[PDB]
């Protein structure tokens, strides 16, 4: 920028999207990465492998195409994340993928976070992934209990129209249950 | 195809230059060899450029020299039309000459020694301390230029 001697960062570093130091440590395993990403409204999970001209995504799942299986709830929450992880995990298994390492990009390793939920899902789908059980949420929160109880302090629906008034961690079970047998794209 | 004639001795000449002449089958002063005009061969003659005389000879001249100084891979045998015919693919010296010039074959391929051991130039040459452009006898020559040298060393 300033002159011939100036040093311009790698594009993905400028864009503040890729942590190259963590990337390298990740690639060390030689295993596929379970890319866990979030959006204000959605949660994505991809199983990426290394390629000659860039990464190769072998299996993925987005919180949006969750409805495609009977999801009638918001998609930016814990239960959402887990399921998206399980969905991607299953597709992953179908693709012949057996193991992977969790890549949470620029997110924080906070306990009970959604990326770990995504990791829990992928693991349950059958994917073998290096993890630590007590850094994950306590199932109930994954089910979405923390939100149901939050609506108990109602007075005004937590969900604008949406579905239900007191919400449903049960809807969660119905879905997980669904994903664990048959159905298309899995 | 160019005619190569060593005009300068081995004493004091770089070894990598002397080895090149040897890879081109010339191991003595006044010895001549025919070399295809290829990238590989071009580089070699360029490196030998200061101790040699080279250039494309005329059909006639090559014939004169082939007849006069060509030899079998082994032996005294004169390489005359009959020899050429009874030993090569061609029917006579002219046929062989043309093939060499058009770089279709080589002296070895036709059972001939790769070296035409010429005679010193009758009348003497233009000197081995300067190139042609300066009145000397070193370097690339004219077809008329080479012919004179080759004919004087017939």
């Amino acid at each position: 920028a300033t002159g011939p001697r100036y040093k311009v960062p790698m594009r993905r570093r400028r864009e503040a999207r890729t942590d190259y130091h963590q990337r390298l440590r990740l690639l060390k395993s030689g295993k596929p990465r379970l890319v866990a990403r979030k959006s204000n409204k959605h949660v994505r999970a991809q199983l990426v492998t290394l390629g000659p001209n860039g990464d190769d995504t072998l299996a993925s799942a987005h919180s949006s195409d969750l409805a495609e299986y009977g999801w009638e709830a918001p998609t930016g929450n814990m239960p959402s994340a887990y399921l998206t992880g399980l969905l991607a995990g299953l597709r992953a298994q179908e693709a012949g993928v057996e193991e992977a390492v969790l890549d949470i990009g620029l997110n924080s390793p906070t306990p009970g976070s959604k990326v770990f939920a995504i990791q829990e899902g992928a693991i349950d789908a059958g994917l073998d992934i290096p993890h630590n059980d007590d850094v994950l949420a306590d199932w109930q929160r994954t089910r979405g209990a923390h939100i149901a109880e939050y609506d108990e302090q109602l007075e005004e629906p937590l969900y604008s129209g949406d579905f239900d008034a007191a919400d449903l961690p049960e809807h969660f079970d119905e879905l997980r249950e669904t994903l664990l047998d048959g159905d298309i794209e899995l | 195809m160019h005619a190569l004639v060593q005009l300068r001795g081995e004493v004091n000449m770089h070894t990598d230059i002397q080895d090149t002449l040897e890879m081109l089958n010339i191991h003595h002063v006044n010895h001549c060899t025919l070399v295809p005009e290829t990238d590989a061969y071009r580089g070699m003659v360029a490196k030998v450029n200061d101790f040699v005389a080279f250039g494309e000879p005329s059909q006639e001249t090559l014939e004169t020299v082939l007849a006069t100084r060509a030899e079998p891979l082994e032996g005294d045998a004169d390489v005359d039309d009959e020899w050429v015919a009874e030993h090569t693919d061609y029917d006579d010296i002219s046929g062989l000459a043309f093939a060499l010039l058009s770089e279709e074959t080589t002296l070895r391929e036709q059972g001939l020694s790769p070296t035409l051991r010429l005679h010193p130039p009758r009348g003497g040459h233009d000197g081995v301390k300067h190139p042609v452009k300066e009145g000397g006898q070193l370097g690339k020559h004219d077809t008329e230029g080479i012919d004179d040298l080759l004919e004087a060393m017939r």
Partner: protein, 140 residues
């Protein structure tokens, strides 16, 4: 266009740059939340050679905590103009600084795909005076 272009107060930093404290107490009551130590850098003649060393405190207030404070701070100040930032900030007073900016600031404060706010979208000294002046007082 507007609504997302109109200024707002983002944190008000009240700090007492002492030279070695008991002062926190008043900051806590003047603001409403715990103060933070102020270590210093470099060794210097004001018998301030200690690198890591309490030498003052500060308090960053946000939202209501910031307004409810300025609703008494500002009144205790007169100044304006020249004493304003090139980014639409201003400090008066024990110091009390007011950082001002527009709606899309998080873009430059978050971790992922963060980015610097464009000069156009920055807050000018003038555009600042207006906002505040338009909130219980007068400029210059």
């Amino acid at each position: 266009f507007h609504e997302m272009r109109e200024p707002r107060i983002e944190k008000v930093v009240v700090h007492m740059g002492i030279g070695h404290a008991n002062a926190e107490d008043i900051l806590g009551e003047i603001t409403g939340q715990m103060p933070v130590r102020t270590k210093a850098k470099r060794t210097v003649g004001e018998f301030d050679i200690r690198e890591g060393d309490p030498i003052g405190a500060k308090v960053t207030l946000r939202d209501e905590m910031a307004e409810e404070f300025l609703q008494t701070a500002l009144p205790l100040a007169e100044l304006a103009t020249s004493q304003f930032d090139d980014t639409g900030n201003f400090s008066f007073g024990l110091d009390v600084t007011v950082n001002l900016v527009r709606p899309g600031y998080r873009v430059a404060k978050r971790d992922k795909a963060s980015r610097s706010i464009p000069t156009k979208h920055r807050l000018n000294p003038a555009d600042a005076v207006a906002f505040i002046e338009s909130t219980y007082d007068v400029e210059v």
